[PDB]
């Protein structure tokens, strides 16, 4: 209960929520792409490896998204997925569309 509530608060209180771990190249890439849209003000990155309940968090993220790996990316509570999912959305115009509907990019 506590772990799920804590994860939910991160997803619900931040338009862009990224779950990451230490020294994770695809986390770093995903975060950099998002900051490239000047989303910093509405982004939260949580390092779930630096947490006593990493496994519980990963299991919950899999319940929500289908995968336990990081990065795990949510935008306005919608599941984007991982860095590869973000790259596909970015290249195909879907990411910009998401952000426009949220007023985050013109």
Report on the architecture of this protein:
This protein is α+β, with helices and mostly antiparallel strands and about 110 residues long. It has one domain (about 1-105): Glutaredoxin. The chain contains five helices and four strands, in the order H-E-H-E-H-E-E-H-H. Helix 2 runs parallel beside helix 4 (about 85-90). The termini are far apart. InterPro entries: GLR_AS, GLRX1, Glutaredoxin, Glutaredoxin_euk/vir, Glutaredoxin_subgr, Thioredoxin-like_sf. One of its GO terms (molecular function) is protein-disulfide reductase (glutathione) activity. Belongs to the glutaredoxin family.
List keywords for this structure.
106 residues; alpha+beta; Glutaredoxin; four-stranded mixed sheet; 4 strands; 17% strand; zinc; metal ion binding; protein-disulfide reductase (glutathione) activity; oxidoreductase; disulfide bond
């Amino acid at each position: 209960e506590a772990v799920k509530k804590w994860v939910n608060k991160i997803i619900e209180e931040n338009i862009i929520a990224v779950f990451a771990k230490t020294e994770c190249p695809y986390c770093i890439k995903a975060i950099s792409i998002l900051k490239g849209y000047n989303l910093n003000s509405h982004m939260h990155v949580e390092n779930i490896e630096k947490n006593p309940d990493m496994a519980n968090i990963q299991a919950y993220l899999k319940e929500l998204t289908g995968k336990s790996s990081v990065p795990r990316i949510f935008i306005n509570k919608d599941v984007v997925g991982g860095c590869d999912d973000l790259v596909k959305e970015n290249d195909e115009g879907k990411l910009k569309e998401r952000l426009q509907k949220l007023g985050l990019v013109n």
